[model samples]
Target: RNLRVLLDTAIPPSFCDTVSSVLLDDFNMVSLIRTSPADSLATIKQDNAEIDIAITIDEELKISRFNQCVLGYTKAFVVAHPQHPLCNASLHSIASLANYRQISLGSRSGQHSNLLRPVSDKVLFVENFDDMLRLVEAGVGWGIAPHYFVEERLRNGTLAVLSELYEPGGIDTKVYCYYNTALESERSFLRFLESARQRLRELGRQ
Candidate 1:
């Protein structure tokens, strides 16, 4: 009766509903907690927390980075917001982001820290990406975030693409789902995770 799932905020909002549908309909999982991937993993390891699944994304959308620890685990794709124009005019490189004022999630030295480190030490840590996007929209500064949250603003012309300038390699994040391998022994939880993964993949392809 104690089933739990942990997810990262990097998951697009649009996909969240579909994911929830699979979890409820297939797994009968009743409890879910969503937060940054770094936070979720840290909590799991530190507190020996029970997570039916843990979700996260790579700093870049490239899936290969997670190959060793993440492959074979439950996973899904979620759209991430493009880099801010002020950060990268071309939405591809990070070289230009060196001088732009930045608002980051924090400096705890996880995915975000490593991602932004090459740009310089001008990061202003905020509570989360939501706040960072708000600040970016308000012209406070530029940042990287999940696309679902900023798409509306971008379509409305409140935000512009900062393409190909922030990172020489390109800016993207990958969303993942990790679970206690032991928990997979439960038929219901396995079914739920698989369903959620399929649904998310369908959404991404769209």
Candidate 2:
């Protein structure tokens, strides 16, 4: 059985880690690639890419879809590490955090990026959540990331979420699995995705 996956950048790294695992061990799929949606879409449209399945975010233009799911909402924030100057400061408003540096997601695209409502002026632009976490922990600057990505650090006194003008409620991100639904191989993969999502959610609860 041969199945190839063309994954979009919006999908989490952890999801692809699991995708590589199950596909390699069970289905002999070894040609999965992670990249931007435009690259994947263009390649497919030109009959250059063989994608058995594709994973993409909601904000992107969808070429086709077989199945989709809610990956769960993540609470966004301006976070600080234990050693930062603002670490102990009582932030009454989002404006109070203006003095510090930030790892911002204010990227090339507008709505597609999960940027802070009013992005900071003094900040570094970054897209990867893992990179964001590392920079925050180094006391280099304040950065924003999803709750689950920074949860362990929060619990361990390594980081804390700053007070916003209004509480930043969780942001919902849905993932679509583009595939040939009629194929038994693809159906099995659909089941595997749900199982991994559930497993990751349960683990994140800790």
Candidate 3:
């Protein structure tokens, strides 16, 4: 049977790379459509929808309309370049960097950027993880990034965490896979979910 799956923007490339590698085989056929998390949900809302499932990281939905399973979790931190003046300071609180430009996520069509989320000084916006990482690396302004994307930067001393910047200093990024009730009991869906969970664990650890 043919299955068309959708990947939300919030889903990581590493996860997609892992799943594509396993599902590319003729033995376990699948077709993937990459789109925004919001777009993915819209696709599922259509009558006789071609899309079977959507992978999401943060959004919750009514079980009456859809069913979902937890895939895994991610970690994130507020990070800045080592050369940043604030990086070498005592910075005892989140407000310490109130004068710096904060990088924030932009709300794409059918999405909310959470522009009102938080800030100290000026704000710059980017819509996705890789671009956000690149902007921060170029010193476009300090921003929050997922652990996987910032792992190398932190290890190499290119960037440092704002441990004293935010109260929590980090966040638990939960991952999930949303599917229509049509396939809730399908064996294929369960197999793919198991594979995704295992792969996500490997990703989180790295």
Top candidate, metric lDDT: 3
For model 3, how does the per-residue alpha-carbon lDDT over 28-112 read when each residue is reduced to its tens digit?
6678877644345556667576666666554646535778887776556788877777777865456776678877664433444
Over 1-206, each residue of candidate 1 has an lDDT whose tens digit, in order, gives: 36676667766665566666776786654577877644655555544566655556533334221221231122221112335444333343445566666666655565553533424456666767777877776666666666666666766766665543333222445555555656656787667666776666676666
Off by over 4 Å in 1: 58-92, 108-118, 164-172
Q: Candidate 2: minimum summed lDDT over ten consecutive residues — where?
A: 109-118
Q: How do all models score by TM-score?
A: 0.71, 0.55, 0.71
Candidate 1 overall lDDT versus native: 0.55
Tell me how candidate 2 scores on lDDT: 0.60
Residue 172 CA displacement from its true place in model 3, Å: 2.7
By how many angstroms RMSD does model 1 differ from the true structure? Answer: 6.0
- List candidate 2 stretches off by more than 4 Å: 6-26, 34-58, 61-68, 71-77, 83-86, 92-99, 105-118, 127-134, 146-156, 163-186, 193-206
**Tens digits of lDDT, candidate 2, 32-107:** 7776443444444444566666665533344443444444433455677876877676653557667678776544
Candidate 3 weakest ten by summed lDDT: 107-116
Clashes within 3 Å, all models in order: 25, 0, 0
lDDT of 1 at 111: 54
C-alpha lDDT of all candidate models, in order: 0.55, 0.60, 0.66
